[PDB]
Amino acid sequence: KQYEKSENDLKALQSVGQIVGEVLKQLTEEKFIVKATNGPRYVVGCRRQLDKSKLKPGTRVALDMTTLTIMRYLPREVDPLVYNMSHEDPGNVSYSEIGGLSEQIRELREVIELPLTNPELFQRVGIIPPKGCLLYGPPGTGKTLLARAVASQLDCNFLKVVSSSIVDKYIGESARLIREMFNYARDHQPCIIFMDEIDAIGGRRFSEGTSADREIQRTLMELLNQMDGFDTLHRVKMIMATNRPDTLDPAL
Amino acid sequence: AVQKVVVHPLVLLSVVDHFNRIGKVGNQKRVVGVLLGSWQKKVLDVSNSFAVPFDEDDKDDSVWFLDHDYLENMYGMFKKVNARERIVGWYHTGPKLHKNDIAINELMKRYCPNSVLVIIDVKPKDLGLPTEAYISVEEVHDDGTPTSKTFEHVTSEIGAEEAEEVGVEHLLRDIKDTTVGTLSQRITNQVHGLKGLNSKLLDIRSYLEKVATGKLPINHQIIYQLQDVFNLLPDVSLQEFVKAFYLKTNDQMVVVYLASLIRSVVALHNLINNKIANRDAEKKEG
Amino acid sequence: EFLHAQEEVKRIQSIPLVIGQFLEAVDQNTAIVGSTTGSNYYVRILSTIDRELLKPNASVALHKHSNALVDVLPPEADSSIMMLTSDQKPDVMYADIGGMDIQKQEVREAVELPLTHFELYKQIGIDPPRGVLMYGPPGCGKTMLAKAVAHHTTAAFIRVVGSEFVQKYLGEGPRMVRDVFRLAKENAPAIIFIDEIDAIATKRFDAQT
Amino acid sequence: TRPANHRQLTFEEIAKSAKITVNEVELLVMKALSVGLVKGSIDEVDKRVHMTWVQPRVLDLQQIKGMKDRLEFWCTDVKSMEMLVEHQAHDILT
Amino acid sequence: AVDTAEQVYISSLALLKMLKHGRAGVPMEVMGLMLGEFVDDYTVRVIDVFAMPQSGTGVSVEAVDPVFQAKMLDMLKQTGRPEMVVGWYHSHPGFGCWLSGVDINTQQSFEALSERAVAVVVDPIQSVKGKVVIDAFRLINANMMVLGHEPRQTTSNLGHLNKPSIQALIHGLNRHYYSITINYRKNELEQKMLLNLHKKSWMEGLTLQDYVVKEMLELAKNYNKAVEEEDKMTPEQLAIKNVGKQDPKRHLEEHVDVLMTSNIVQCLAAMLDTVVFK
Amino acid sequence: ENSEKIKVNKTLPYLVSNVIELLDVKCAVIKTSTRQTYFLPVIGLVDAEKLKP
Amino acid sequence: HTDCTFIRVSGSELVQKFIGEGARMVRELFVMAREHAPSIIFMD
Amino acid sequence: LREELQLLQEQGSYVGEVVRAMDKKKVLVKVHPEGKFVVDVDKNIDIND
């Protein structure tokens, strides 16, 4: 048996490392303007059956080494700063863990859980379901714990960000992480967002005389557009929790 | 369920130089050999093969020689160069068969899911097709006898796989890619008209010789069954295709309207700049 | 052999075509081309390409080994997002909008009537149209009008937002906007869109902050 | 038995020789529609039982011999008129 | 003791096993041995290029398996012909097919035993039909610089082998190397049957296949009207009145002949009813 | 098999590189120490559990 | 209408890229203006 | 005219960046993005050129 697995490895000696590339744009039915990830640019074609319609510019392809034609396409890309906080989310006991919040459980359950269980009662009405809410009060009262109760309830698509590690020292890097997270949320349908300590990233727009929360103004405007966008988010809920909801922007 | 294979003439040229072996080793007339290849699909490719030192008694025709020094260790070499190109079947020349062939198939059906016998052609003068496949079949009868095993006419072709014409189309040294409408169509007219209707003369050899001396497959199970397909349109005086004549007005409708309007456009094509460049070349010469 | 010449032109092409860029041209059918490999070359270029298509440092096609100019690609990939290309236009502006008759009326006067009735800009002889600004509090339906103005016409609605313009490497946002605008001058006078506004583009010029 | 045309047959030989009435010839073909050997496009403005493709016979060895007036007819007539085309398309051999 | 212009009467199967040995021979370069017959002095012939195992370790003189040599020739003995080796082949399918630095060692490592043992360089990944990159070299040495390196005895064979003389490091390697001449054999014993299977195969096989027709024309007639308005922009472009134009920008053709042979196909296609039926 | 696989390690020093990520559509992305990327759909002589990105 | 003598390079367009990025001693422009000695340089 | 097109197959002599020449009929070429290379000259061009 291990001789047969080693025979598969001996056949795998014939197997070739494919090339990491990405589609710049599609030119024709078989001409594909792509770029090698570590350098130059090319125009190649697919194998026979690679579903060229699903090749959309910004996807990642694996190419042949020698012939250099397209062999496969993976997801796209992931930017693994998203990894270390999305699947970081643990499962929990359900909302039996909390108590004395049955109005919050039930009505917040109405604003969250319904348009994924059935959005067509909204469509029997016709009216679009709402988008998100904000929890407040004293700090540490279990806003995060309630979010973990939701993390136990839906068990599906939780993207929970501590939401202050976004400004490293660059300007649009924060925005680029925002765009990547919102594109991953645009990818998967029933996405859930949770954010905490918004005041380090939401802030307030005063008269511009400083030089570091203008970054929070532009990043805040990535929130102002990109909670709406042109395309509305489809089954992408946004659960917000802060300690002071006073200093956030009234535009938000 | 085999329509076609891809045939590389490389090891067919090994059938050519083993056809050079048999002319100088002695009494062995027919080139018999063993066909390598890989089942990928109903379509298949043959990339290699090998030609067997084989003898065949004319008395009790079922005397095979497929040496296993010649088989096993050469399969270790042919395995050693490539794990992919293993056996797929075997071959021999002549058009019809060999009283031993079926047994020679069953020697290697232990090696292959479908050991195919592709009867090959060393001297092509044919009216039909080149080398053609024969798959494992158990058609027997409606009788309930022991199982028939004679391997029936399962269509194949000469397929062309990959580039390989750095040699081949350099070795053409004669031929032209015709832009069809330039006599290639009448070449096909000679080959399908002539080479189809002499096969029709083989079919009057069938449907006259079987009336004459033909036993049990005179009307086994396909003669009347494809006298149906013969009864598409065989009728007597002129067959009276009355639908097909104003249907043919709907046909020749298209061709004469396109030729009429479009060849008047061709009259602009030829005529107009023919005159312009004509009289530029004519009176601008002075 | 005429057909051999014709088919010969594209044997070694179009399968594994590398991409460089034009630089300069000394003479007939032989020119200078920089590369996406990092080095520059002076190679014999074809008679195939029209000779006036080699003004810019255009995206061009070359052989791996031979490195011959066979094709020139005048566009390059996009600016950033490139107009969303199909359907994401959210549609609610022409046959459906709650209360913007001044601005719907004027945008209609200033987009749709220019796009067809160019000769009404002739017998009176007025002008082509140009840009416009909107101002309304957050909840006056500011984006909706742009959303299905993008929908209900088939204009090349290349939108951006300009909060990405502020960067680390220098001149980066300027390269972005000139991808937008050379992309704009490339394609069409249809409609090309930038929602970008207050607290990034303020009139305080004279502050060495 | 008649190979030739008038394949849009009236029901007269059907209502006569096949011991059926006029109201049942449709069943005589609709049940045959469930059979599927012949799939005629039967006229119903003239009640004409039309003949399409069929499963013809089992053996006519007198026409396994006597098929020559169709088979050799096909052979030398498509081959001869083949040589009338190629004899017309002769000196474009080029 | 004398130098003569040689010749290589090539077995077409040699080049077949090289195009398979470089086509399937993944451009990690490889090595083999050449199996012909030293016919005479002024020529040589190859009759066999055999296959090598997956030596995916390195082009080297040590990559030769001698029990595969002895068992290989033994399998030529149980087949009809146990011919003789004449040298060695290798593959350079990646780069511009010039003599590698193992060839500059394994050549004289092989021809130390052999007489000539001419190199074989190949790259089928150059072209499909147009460029035939077969290559072969005879290693001259510094022992034979006593005499001049001019066989010359029959000329214009190495005059037409001299006619290219363009490979970068090989032009440079004029020292130590002079190539050999390779013709292709009069292969009509196989070129006949490659011809008869060539055209008996590649035009509708049994040729009762095409004798698709008119929706192709429908699409082709919409082609052949849809280009006609821009084909007729050229007489407007011929309306320069006096003279204002360089080369006419002749788009006269490419739409004559498409209609010509295409509607020859439409009219004999109109014949095929009265050709097939009677 | 393993003679030639010891040979593959023996050919040159067999360029130690970096794994960028690992997918299971078993599959891995290599970055060379020349900083060049090579995806493989077939890993080879180790297990995906033994390694990590 | 000076027929050669005005080559408005416009001199400030991508200002963090047309100036100094690649053209440190922007004198590439000045080699232009010399080797096109009928020229006029403009900036913003 | 069409048979000329084998000249296309000689890949083009790439642009060299010469600072200046020195004596002994040799030059100083600094290749595009590479280092300095003293090489010998052709005959149709001169040291004075």
Ligand SMILES: Nc1ncnc2c1ncn2[C@@H]1O[C@H](COP(=O)(O)OP(=O)(O)OP(=O)(O)O)[C@@H](O)[C@H]1O
């Ligand atoms: N309403 C509640 N029901 C059940 N458990 C609760 C409730 N409120 C708080 N808890 C408990 O409190 C703990 C912490 O809750 P959580 O993490 O939400 O604090 P928090 O509200 O996020 O505080 P802060 O936002 O100020 O850090 C959890 O383990 C949870 O079990």
Ligand SMILES: Nc1ncnc2c1ncn2[C@@H]1O[C@H](COP(=O)(O)OP(=O)(O)OP(=O)(O)O)[C@@H](O)[C@H]1O
């Ligand atoms: N006239 C309207 N009637 C009904 N709903 C409207 C109207 N205008 C806007 N809306 C609501 O607002 C959404 C989009 O509003 P829009 O984004 O256009 O305003 P806005 O851009 O957010 O304002 P601002 O950009 O100054 O913050 C619609 O999807 C709808 O829910």
Ligand SMILES: [Zn+2]
């Ligand atoms: Zn080699």
